[PDB]
């Protein structure tokens, strides 16, 4: 208990006990930007939940901060560039969480293609009048088998989706800021430029982090490039021009849209709500599963301790930080 | 244009044209037993769907019948014992259909576990009040990852399902009327007796043909063995004692049940309709997909023509027939 760690959320008791074995902890549940500004200087590291934002204004007071462990799969609540400039290591949680998200995504894909979510409503309404009504009445349904799937973002989650899709007989295409050749041949995924992928893919999956460079990466023009195709989003609503997506749906241009995320959450009303056949919509819970929720805490604690032990964690988001402040400089344990 | 073929279901024009190249065709849509036995004498072969029952009554007048091609995955609608006795070859369809059903099955599994179908309804009903509402509203969700999945039936569909589940991180157990040593090491699936599988599995999947022996394979007593577990059915409703399954669901014992088939189809009313969270129900359309169905028609036509050309189709269902009437004896093409 020598490094001073601030836990900014309600973590599982067990994960906390593990952390306390190595550091002194201060529990400051979901602090406002002002409250965190006045206490952040006390910590060598912090464990934060998505709801807490680590802005450049917060970092200005992080005099001894060495590591920020995001207890989530995403890290858009962190000003990455500013953290990097200050030599602050930022980590995120993969493990069972990444697996759970990737599993959920494939479920979104199969529902968007095969319409199971729609059929479930259908039968419960008593509409199953006959074999003919279904096998003739149901609009054309395409299978995932034999389709070309293009994935944008090949991080922990993107790779997990790719591995799950192979046995479904799809052809994989992908794009990522940092290209992964060591993954390409393994999963038989052909690297391509964004637009080339949008044009050549039958199905497009969004597994990108939300940054200034990915905001509306799927703009109105690109939505047009997706006429007759399927779009699946598990990153953030802002990865797409949601108004443009919706319009494409209502006009019958975009064949289908499945998403677990929206530009403005929570969503209580939406034009896409009436399009039950063309869309699959979930209330942002792709990472919600018992096993995953139990693992996140341990992983977040492990990621933070690794850095303070002078070890580079595999889930380090801003690897460039290594050049700014060599890991030896932040080793406390 | 030598053999005469009776097409007893609605087939796509392309498949029919293919068939007309080699045989004179007569279309008799979904005939009753009395209607069919009255005309069955004119055909060298017939193409049929699950709704047409080929019985001893019908086969009595089947003087020139040499092959029965089922335009489907299942063949429980055919009396194999009588067909075999009369030296009639019975075939089913494999290929893209099997792939489409396996894909569908995984969709049912992910929905049954992760509740996407329920959440889709939930959000469209405008109940997404907040993040807390969701994450607290339902955390008992379990991921497919790390689970023990027991598959009953390891034929084309069973294998296709198993191959798909591997990357999801499951442990596979299975039972089959005919053990498959090669699949066991290939897919690392552990062979088990039926009751042992039901006891050790977290999730049980039914991909067995319905026969007198597999009738109610999941009976009342076995349902009790599933307390706290998940059951998925994509074969035929009669594979389970549906009433017993329904009770186990209402009594909160069986954790979840998803099925694309029921003992009495079509189903316009059912006790399970109110159990939106605990079940996933689809109107028997697991094999319904464009690419797959176009393949089914050509496959059914080709399985029939192969027999008449004196070739043993790999999809031959009743192999015993070879001892009654060798393939050379039915060669007409």
XYZ file of C-alpha atoms in Angstrom:
666
model
C 0.000 0.000 0.000
C 2.481 2.686 -1.128
C 1.099 3.964 -4.428
C -1.946 6.190 -3.785
C -4.916 5.065 -5.881
C -8.243 6.772 -6.353
C -11.178 4.515 -7.129
C -13.835 6.691 -8.765
C -16.626 4.128 -8.890
C -18.269 1.380 -6.881
C -16.053 -1.616 -7.576
C -16.610 -5.224 -6.571
C -15.377 -5.877 -3.011
C -12.968 -8.618 -4.151
C -11.284 -6.486 -6.814
C -10.910 -3.774 -4.187
C -9.329 -6.175 -1.701
C -6.797 -7.194 -4.315
C -5.956 -3.531 -5.009
C -5.617 -2.666 -1.306
C -2.987 -5.369 -0.990
C -0.701 -3.222 -3.142
C -1.843 0.400 -2.752
C -3.533 2.825 -0.406
C -7.004 3.478 -1.769
C -9.365 6.412 -1.580
C -12.974 5.807 -2.599
C -14.383 8.847 -4.378
C -17.557 7.707 -6.091
C -18.485 9.320 -9.415
C -16.999 12.787 -8.840
C -18.071 15.906 -10.728
C -15.444 17.685 -12.808
C -14.881 20.251 -10.054
C -14.630 17.727 -7.228
C -12.126 15.597 -9.160
C -10.059 18.704 -9.930
C -9.480 19.272 -6.227
C -8.448 15.709 -5.340
C -6.770 14.306 -8.478
C -3.334 15.565 -7.460
C -3.243 13.047 -4.619
C -3.081 10.000 -6.885
C -0.405 7.965 -8.630
C -3.214 6.179 -10.450
C -6.991 6.091 -10.775
C -9.617 3.562 -11.780
C -12.462 5.309 -13.603
C -15.893 4.390 -15.005
C -17.247 5.787 -18.322
C -19.475 8.319 -16.529
C -16.381 10.123 -15.150
C -14.569 12.325 -17.657
C -10.824 12.921 -17.429
C -10.537 16.210 -19.291
C -7.462 18.283 -19.997
C -8.634 20.536 -17.157
C -8.632 17.577 -14.784
C -5.177 16.488 -15.928
C -3.746 19.955 -15.309
C -3.918 19.051 -11.620
C -2.682 15.448 -11.950
C 0.765 16.324 -10.573
C 1.710 12.739 -9.644
C -0.684 10.721 -11.817
C 1.073 7.849 -13.587
C -1.730 5.602 -14.782
C -5.439 5.751 -15.538
C -7.210 2.382 -15.625
C -10.546 2.663 -17.394
C -12.888 0.084 -16.026
C -14.701 -0.387 -19.352
C -13.882 -1.535 -22.851
C -13.882 2.050 -24.108
C -11.826 5.124 -23.267
C -13.463 8.087 -25.008
C -14.028 9.606 -21.547
C -10.266 10.206 -21.451
C -8.353 12.949 -23.266
C -5.806 10.503 -24.667
C -3.482 12.985 -26.377
C -3.174 15.154 -23.275
C -2.570 12.055 -21.133
C 0.165 10.950 -23.530
C 1.868 14.351 -23.523
C 2.036 14.156 -19.747
C 3.478 10.649 -19.838
C 0.329 9.143 -18.320
C -0.371 5.494 -19.171
C -4.006 4.795 -20.078
C -5.425 1.270 -20.129
C -8.768 -0.361 -20.945
C -10.292 -3.770 -20.144
C -10.469 -6.607 -22.677
C -10.660 -10.201 -21.457
C -14.145 -11.582 -20.890
C -15.578 -8.139 -21.529
C -14.231 -8.059 -25.086
C -15.510 -11.618 -25.622
C -18.980 -10.711 -24.328
C -19.191 -7.680 -26.623
C -18.019 -9.649 -29.665
C -20.605 -12.352 -28.894
C -23.381 -9.770 -28.602
C -22.311 -8.239 -31.920
C -22.636 -11.533 -33.799
C -26.069 -11.833 -32.210
C -26.931 -8.402 -33.629
C -25.705 -9.521 -37.048
C -27.682 -12.764 -37.145
C -30.832 -10.915 -36.030
C -30.339 -8.179 -38.662
C -29.862 -10.851 -41.338
C -32.304 -13.555 -40.243
C -34.882 -11.370 -38.453
C -35.307 -13.568 -35.392
C -36.098 -10.572 -33.191
C -38.830 -9.642 -35.662
C -40.170 -13.198 -35.959
C -40.382 -13.507 -32.160
C -42.714 -10.481 -31.997
C -44.599 -11.856 -35.011
C -45.427 -15.295 -33.585
C -46.318 -13.951 -30.142
C -48.865 -11.671 -31.846
C -50.620 -14.769 -33.202
C -49.709 -13.925 -36.801
C -48.367 -17.396 -37.690
C -51.330 -18.363 -39.864
C -49.578 -20.965 -41.998
C -46.358 -22.227 -43.535
C -47.155 -20.236 -46.679
C -47.662 -16.974 -44.788
C -44.096 -17.256 -43.500
C -42.223 -18.842 -46.411
C -43.985 -16.604 -48.930
C -45.065 -13.664 -46.800
C -41.700 -12.886 -45.216
C -39.707 -10.473 -47.356
C -36.470 -11.848 -48.790
C -34.099 -13.062 -46.082
C -30.393 -13.436 -46.728
C -28.033 -15.640 -44.744
C -24.650 -14.627 -43.398
C -23.062 -17.551 -45.231
C -21.055 -16.485 -48.261
C -21.226 -12.747 -47.542
C -18.331 -10.296 -47.359
C -18.059 -8.675 -43.938
C -15.966 -5.562 -43.513
C -14.913 -4.621 -39.992
C -13.782 -1.115 -39.082
C -11.529 -1.246 -36.039
C -9.416 -4.295 -35.308
C -8.819 -3.915 -31.607
C -9.624 -6.509 -28.939
C -13.308 -6.454 -29.848
C -12.804 -6.334 -33.613
C -10.533 -9.387 -33.524
C -13.032 -11.338 -31.389
C -15.814 -10.691 -33.898
C -13.613 -11.739 -36.822
C -12.742 -15.054 -35.163
C -16.414 -15.792 -34.457
C -17.498 -15.007 -38.020
C -15.072 -17.341 -39.842
C -17.132 -20.550 -39.300
C -20.199 -18.735 -40.639
C -18.597 -18.805 -44.065
C -18.106 -15.067 -44.601
C -15.242 -13.292 -46.380
C -13.506 -10.808 -44.089
C -12.335 -7.295 -44.944
C -11.072 -4.788 -42.389
C -9.557 -1.391 -41.747
C -7.794 -0.004 -38.690
C -5.627 3.024 -37.890
C -2.819 0.657 -36.970
C -2.773 -2.276 -39.392
C -2.432 -5.774 -37.916
C -0.592 -8.128 -40.280
C -0.035 -10.646 -37.484
C -3.825 -10.985 -37.416
C -4.646 -10.650 -41.107
C -3.430 -14.058 -42.278
C -4.499 -15.737 -39.032
C -8.122 -14.712 -39.552
C -7.871 -14.377 -43.330
C -8.844 -10.712 -43.240
C -7.895 -8.548 -46.228
C -6.771 -5.045 -45.259
C -8.502 -2.246 -47.184
C -9.038 1.510 -47.140
C -12.294 2.635 -45.550
C -14.166 3.597 -48.718
C -12.834 0.589 -50.633
C -14.225 -1.583 -47.815
C -17.622 0.139 -47.768
C -18.005 -0.457 -51.498
C -16.807 -4.073 -51.480
C -18.500 -5.246 -48.250
C -22.020 -6.719 -48.023
C -22.052 -6.099 -44.255
C -20.100 -3.426 -42.364
C -19.351 -3.592 -38.605
C -18.263 -0.595 -36.542
C -15.785 -1.575 -33.808
C -13.958 1.760 -33.582
C -13.216 3.939 -30.551
C -14.808 7.390 -30.684
C -12.178 10.086 -31.278
C -11.939 13.365 -33.176
C -10.753 11.335 -36.170
C -13.628 8.822 -36.058
C -16.494 11.191 -35.275
C -19.069 10.625 -38.036
C -16.590 8.415 -39.904
C -19.726 7.066 -41.587
C -20.965 10.419 -42.885
C -23.922 11.031 -45.196
C -21.803 10.419 -48.303
C -20.644 7.072 -46.986
C -24.196 6.151 -45.989
C -24.900 6.501 -49.706
C -22.058 4.099 -50.435
C -24.002 1.605 -48.307
C -27.181 1.454 -50.373
C -28.346 -2.165 -50.399
C -26.005 -3.135 -47.563
C -26.126 -3.861 -43.816
C -24.541 -1.675 -41.139
C -23.851 -2.790 -37.544
C -22.617 -0.437 -34.810
C -21.218 -1.496 -31.423
C -18.830 1.397 -30.866
C -20.557 4.731 -30.282
C -23.534 6.448 -31.886
C -21.265 9.296 -33.006
C -19.288 6.977 -35.274
C -22.114 7.583 -37.740
C -24.288 10.492 -38.894
C -27.302 8.892 -37.204
C -29.782 11.265 -38.885
C -28.363 10.207 -42.269
C -28.539 6.513 -41.315
C -32.176 6.832 -40.259
C -33.065 8.679 -43.457
C -31.382 5.940 -45.493
C -33.503 3.371 -43.667
C -36.828 5.149 -44.188
C -36.071 5.654 -47.891
C -35.244 1.980 -48.378
C -31.647 2.666 -49.396
C -29.780 1.139 -46.437
C -30.966 -2.469 -46.215
C -30.565 -2.708 -42.451
C -29.157 -1.089 -39.336
C -28.346 -2.786 -36.041
C -26.933 -0.822 -33.149
C -26.400 -1.009 -29.418
C -25.369 2.669 -29.334
C -26.999 6.025 -30.170
C -25.847 9.645 -30.457
C -28.050 10.729 -27.548
C -28.598 8.119 -24.824
C -30.846 7.041 -23.282
C -33.283 6.809 -26.198
C -36.993 6.813 -25.332
C -38.296 7.826 -28.776
C -36.810 7.368 -32.244
C -37.888 7.193 -35.901
C -36.096 3.863 -36.253
C -38.512 2.356 -33.709
C -41.202 1.667 -36.310
C -38.793 -0.160 -38.638
C -38.837 -3.528 -36.850
C -37.791 -5.524 -39.915
C -34.937 -3.251 -41.050
C -33.312 -2.677 -37.667
C -32.171 -4.325 -34.433
C -31.876 -1.885 -31.558
C -30.510 -2.492 -28.088
C -30.165 -0.179 -25.072
C -26.340 -0.038 -24.915
C -25.698 -3.246 -22.955
C -23.467 -5.251 -25.299
C -21.006 -5.677 -22.445
C -23.559 -6.646 -19.809
C -23.107 -10.255 -18.661
C -22.383 -11.678 -15.182
C -19.018 -13.256 -16.013
C -17.767 -10.097 -17.721
C -18.937 -7.739 -14.946
C -17.032 -9.849 -12.447
C -13.840 -9.844 -14.527
C -13.731 -6.118 -15.337
C -12.835 -5.124 -11.798
C -9.962 -7.573 -11.507
C -8.692 -6.642 -14.970
C -8.838 -2.900 -14.209
C -6.890 -3.437 -10.991
C -4.377 -5.685 -12.739
C -3.866 -3.169 -15.568
C -3.134 -0.372 -13.114
C -0.765 -2.424 -10.939
C 1.186 -3.703 -13.947
C 2.148 -0.123 -14.863
C 3.154 0.741 -11.305
C 5.229 -2.471 -11.247
C 7.065 -1.273 -14.329
C 5.429 -3.750 -16.682
C 3.811 -2.796 -19.983
C 0.212 -4.090 -20.004
C -1.148 -5.563 -23.237
C -4.176 -3.290 -22.982
C -2.155 -0.049 -22.935
C -4.106 2.307 -25.222
C -1.488 5.011 -25.842
C 1.615 2.923 -26.413
C 3.393 6.077 -27.623
C 3.559 7.123 -23.970
C 6.533 4.753 -23.711
C 8.633 7.340 -25.572
C 7.354 10.232 -23.458
C 7.962 8.617 -20.074
C 9.743 5.229 -20.099
C 7.958 2.691 -17.903
C 10.933 2.579 -15.511
C 10.097 6.169 -14.541
C 6.632 5.210 -13.257
C 7.611 1.981 -11.485
C 6.619 2.277 -7.821
C 6.390 -1.415 -6.922
C -38.048 -36.885 -70.732
C -38.415 -40.564 -69.813
C -39.141 -40.853 -66.064
C -42.370 -39.361 -64.727
C -42.061 -37.264 -61.604
C -44.735 -36.004 -59.275
C -43.830 -32.683 -57.670
C -45.983 -32.369 -54.540
C -44.952 -28.935 -53.220
C -44.410 -25.392 -54.516
C -40.987 -25.298 -56.180
C -39.059 -22.443 -57.745
C -39.267 -22.264 -61.531
C -35.517 -22.712 -62.088
C -35.405 -25.998 -60.167
C -38.513 -27.175 -62.000
C -37.003 -26.277 -65.386
C -33.879 -28.204 -64.431
C -36.066 -31.213 -63.619
C -38.037 -30.940 -66.873
C -34.841 -31.370 -68.867
C -34.687 -35.014 -67.783
C -38.248 -35.973 -66.805
C -41.904 -35.401 -67.548
C -43.312 -33.560 -64.557
C -46.718 -33.455 -62.905
C -47.416 -30.868 -60.215
C -49.895 -31.972 -57.568
C -49.805 -29.494 -54.719
C -49.847 -30.890 -51.175
C -52.221 -33.834 -51.824
C -54.093 -35.741 -49.117
C -53.283 -39.421 -48.559
C -56.351 -40.491 -50.517
C -55.586 -38.065 -53.354
C -51.956 -39.198 -53.614
C -52.590 -42.927 -53.460
C -54.941 -42.421 -56.381
C -52.240 -41.003 -58.666
C -48.998 -42.240 -57.101
C -48.931 -45.132 -59.569
C -47.838 -42.966 -62.502
C -44.566 -41.777 -60.916
C -41.013 -43.112 -61.050
C -40.195 -40.525 -58.401
C -41.701 -37.764 -56.280
C -40.423 -34.582 -54.665
C -42.108 -33.781 -51.364
C -42.244 -31.362 -48.421
C -42.659 -32.225 -44.708
C -46.434 -31.763 -44.826
C -47.087 -34.590 -47.280
C -47.117 -37.917 -45.450
C -45.816 -40.879 -47.423
C -47.500 -43.818 -45.736
C -47.959 -47.537 -46.308
C -51.407 -46.524 -47.567
C -49.832 -44.404 -50.293
C -46.960 -46.783 -51.065
C -49.345 -49.690 -51.668
C -50.185 -48.192 -55.071
C -46.601 -47.068 -55.813
C -45.928 -49.648 -58.534
C -43.315 -47.644 -60.472
C -41.829 -45.646 -57.571
C -38.049 -45.720 -57.328
C -37.103 -42.600 -55.397
C -38.520 -40.164 -52.846
C -36.642 -36.847 -52.695
C -37.480 -34.742 -49.653
C -37.239 -31.034 -50.526
C -36.156 -30.485 -46.904
C -33.771 -31.307 -44.096
C -36.204 -33.563 -42.282
C -37.782 -36.796 -43.459
C -39.973 -37.929 -40.569
C -42.899 -37.597 -42.979
C -41.657 -40.719 -44.802
C -42.235 -44.325 -43.682
C -38.673 -45.553 -44.296
C -39.509 -49.079 -43.197
C -42.115 -49.409 -45.931
C -40.048 -47.494 -48.520
C -37.093 -49.760 -47.807
C -39.275 -52.876 -48.013
C -40.437 -51.752 -51.452
C -36.890 -50.891 -52.480
C -37.583 -47.161 -52.667
C -34.658 -44.778 -52.142
C -35.352 -41.825 -49.820
C -33.152 -38.708 -49.849
C -32.998 -35.450 -47.887
C -31.273 -32.131 -48.541
C -27.933 -31.025 -47.129
C -25.520 -28.286 -48.215
C -26.488 -24.613 -47.941
C -29.686 -25.522 -46.083
C -27.662 -27.095 -43.269
C -25.462 -24.006 -43.110
C -28.507 -21.724 -42.975
C -30.161 -23.702 -40.154
C -26.948 -23.869 -38.101
C -26.475 -20.118 -38.491
C -30.084 -19.611 -37.377
C -29.575 -21.874 -34.361
C -26.646 -19.826 -33.078
C -28.819 -16.748 -33.461
C -31.439 -18.419 -31.267
C -28.785 -19.314 -28.690
C -27.330 -15.814 -28.467
C -30.812 -14.347 -28.168
C -31.815 -16.861 -25.496
C -28.688 -16.010 -23.497
C -28.226 -12.267 -24.141
C -31.912 -11.336 -24.628
C -31.432 -9.143 -27.721
C -34.912 -10.016 -28.996
C -36.379 -8.907 -25.657
C -34.256 -5.743 -25.441
C -35.308 -4.799 -28.975
C -38.960 -4.883 -27.854
C -38.017 -3.144 -24.597
C -36.377 -0.147 -26.268
C -39.062 0.238 -28.957
C -41.639 0.380 -26.143
C -39.773 3.437 -24.887
C -38.686 1.843 -21.603
C -35.000 2.777 -21.836
C -35.285 5.242 -18.935
C -31.587 5.267 -18.053
C -28.285 3.363 -18.050
C -28.919 2.302 -14.451
C -32.334 0.930 -15.428
C -30.706 -1.459 -17.906
C -27.626 -2.540 -16.006
C -29.657 -3.043 -12.839
C -32.842 -3.994 -14.663
C -31.279 -7.223 -15.855
C -27.782 -8.336 -14.887
C -28.607 -12.005 -14.557
C -27.585 -12.313 -18.239
C -24.943 -15.003 -18.830
C -22.603 -15.105 -21.820
C -22.180 -18.105 -24.088
C -18.445 -17.867 -23.345
C -17.051 -20.543 -21.033
C -20.262 -22.590 -21.136
C -20.704 -26.319 -21.688
C -22.895 -26.875 -24.733
C -24.370 -30.321 -25.295
C -25.569 -31.101 -28.804
C -27.920 -34.028 -29.391
C -27.479 -35.111 -32.989
C -24.210 -34.767 -34.847
C -25.207 -34.920 -38.486
C -24.715 -32.093 -41.012
C -26.632 -29.523 -38.952
C -25.182 -30.617 -35.628
C -21.675 -30.362 -37.046
C -22.326 -26.940 -38.604
C -23.625 -25.637 -35.248
C -20.628 -27.062 -33.398
C -18.114 -25.546 -35.805
C -19.721 -22.138 -35.276
C -19.744 -22.325 -31.466
C -16.021 -23.097 -31.099
C -14.829 -19.445 -31.433
C -17.449 -18.443 -28.864
C -15.318 -20.163 -26.255
C -17.672 -23.025 -25.381
C -16.841 -26.586 -24.338
C -18.651 -29.075 -26.564
C -20.319 -32.318 -25.451
C -22.514 -34.391 -27.745
C -24.624 -37.469 -28.343
C -25.501 -39.142 -31.632
C -27.223 -42.343 -32.747
C -23.879 -43.086 -34.423
C -20.770 -41.873 -32.593
C -18.321 -39.845 -34.701
C -14.757 -40.389 -33.497
C -13.282 -38.094 -36.160
C -15.509 -35.175 -35.177
C -14.616 -35.764 -31.533
C -10.938 -34.949 -32.042
C -11.549 -32.451 -34.851
C -14.031 -30.319 -32.894
C -12.846 -31.558 -29.493
C -16.433 -32.569 -28.712
C -16.765 -35.128 -25.917
C -19.167 -38.017 -26.534
C -21.628 -38.644 -23.684
C -24.747 -40.673 -22.988
C -27.982 -38.658 -23.178
C -28.643 -38.299 -19.448
C -24.981 -37.669 -18.690
C -24.989 -34.879 -21.300
C -28.153 -33.310 -19.875
C -26.581 -33.341 -16.414
C -23.194 -31.877 -17.356
C -24.283 -29.308 -19.964
C -25.243 -25.688 -19.279
C -26.980 -25.439 -22.646
C -28.600 -28.279 -24.605
C -29.264 -28.134 -28.356
C -31.536 -30.520 -30.272
C -30.473 -31.283 -33.850
C -31.898 -34.776 -34.199
C -34.239 -36.270 -36.791
C -37.599 -37.208 -35.228
C -38.081 -40.988 -35.071
C -39.912 -43.389 -32.767
C -36.643 -43.663 -30.829
C -36.008 -39.906 -30.521
C -39.668 -39.223 -29.725
C -39.839 -37.049 -26.597
C -36.122 -37.691 -26.090
C -36.476 -34.739 -23.693
C -39.286 -36.189 -21.572
C -40.721 -34.916 -18.299
C -38.124 -36.630 -16.117
C -35.260 -35.310 -18.224
C -36.728 -31.813 -18.168
C -36.201 -31.803 -14.393
C -32.511 -32.507 -15.082
C -32.470 -29.179 -16.936
C -33.470 -27.058 -13.949
C -31.312 -23.947 -14.170
C -30.234 -24.711 -17.757
C -31.018 -23.664 -21.337
C -32.700 -25.686 -24.067
C -32.656 -24.967 -27.810
C -34.739 -26.895 -30.381
C -34.433 -26.662 -34.167
C -35.472 -30.167 -35.226
C -39.094 -31.089 -34.589
C -41.373 -30.177 -31.711
C -42.045 -33.779 -30.746
C -38.365 -34.110 -29.764
C -39.540 -32.652 -26.459
C -42.551 -33.200 -24.243
C -43.574 -29.593 -24.948
C -46.041 -29.490 -22.039
C -43.330 -30.519 -19.601
C -41.022 -27.854 -21.029
C -43.741 -25.238 -20.750
C -44.351 -26.126 -17.106
C -40.628 -26.078 -16.275
C -40.516 -22.563 -17.716
C -43.557 -21.249 -15.816
C -42.350 -22.846 -12.596
C -39.075 -21.016 -13.050
C -37.094 -24.246 -13.243
C -35.930 -24.500 -16.864
C -34.002 -21.232 -17.201
C -34.711 -20.773 -20.896
C -36.206 -22.375 -23.992
C -35.811 -21.317 -27.595
C -37.401 -23.147 -30.464
C -38.230 -22.799 -34.124
C -40.496 -25.883 -33.940
C -43.564 -26.988 -31.959
C -45.589 -30.198 -31.537
C -48.580 -28.507 -33.198
C -47.766 -26.156 -36.067
C -48.733 -23.546 -36.861
C -49.001 -21.992 -33.396
C -51.358 -19.017 -33.064
C -51.748 -19.265 -29.289
C -49.468 -20.662 -26.581
C -48.654 -20.372 -22.885
C -45.037 -19.498 -23.713
C -46.018 -16.340 -25.613
C -46.071 -14.359 -22.349
C -42.541 -15.472 -21.419
C -40.642 -12.924 -23.495
C -37.523 -13.023 -21.322
C -37.274 -16.795 -20.799
C -37.921 -17.900 -24.389
C -37.185 -17.222 -28.054
C -39.857 -18.451 -30.463
C -39.729 -18.535 -34.246
C -42.377 -19.776 -36.764
C -40.386 -22.718 -38.117
C -38.334 -20.767 -40.666
C -34.778 -21.735 -39.714
C -34.040 -22.847 -43.269
C -35.608 -19.778 -44.885
C -32.981 -17.714 -46.684
C -32.602 -16.844 -50.380
C -29.352 -18.590 -51.241
C -30.195 -21.655 -49.171
C -33.654 -22.232 -50.647
C -32.482 -21.864 -54.226
C -29.944 -24.548 -53.393
C -32.634 -26.764 -51.832
C -34.635 -26.961 -55.054
C -31.649 -27.930 -57.194
C -30.466 -30.385 -54.532
C -33.847 -32.119 -54.265
C -34.080 -32.373 -58.062
C -30.508 -33.642 -58.315
C -30.863 -36.209 -55.527
C -33.802 -37.678 -57.454
C -32.082 -37.613 -60.844
C -28.928 -39.182 -59.413
C -30.883 -42.230 -58.240
C -32.560 -42.600 -61.607
C -29.145 -42.330 -63.297
C -28.173 -45.271 -61.138
C -25.940 -43.345 -58.739
C -26.097 -43.602 -54.939
C -26.690 -40.072 -53.563
C -24.682 -39.159 -50.480
C -27.958 -37.791 -49.062
C -29.515 -41.268 -49.187
C -31.442 -41.618 -45.927
C -32.368 -45.330 -45.891
C -29.138 -47.144 -46.755
C -30.767 -50.499 -45.984
C -32.585 -50.237 -49.323
C -29.377 -51.183 -51.142
C -29.964 -54.768 -49.975
C -33.497 -54.844 -51.383
C -33.045 -53.166 -54.738
C -29.447 -52.418 -55.829
C -29.040 -49.017 -57.493
C -28.565 -50.601 -60.928
C -32.182 -51.785 -60.862
C -33.649 -48.281 -60.627
C -31.427 -46.777 -63.321
C -33.626 -45.103 -65.938
C -31.334 -42.344 -67.198
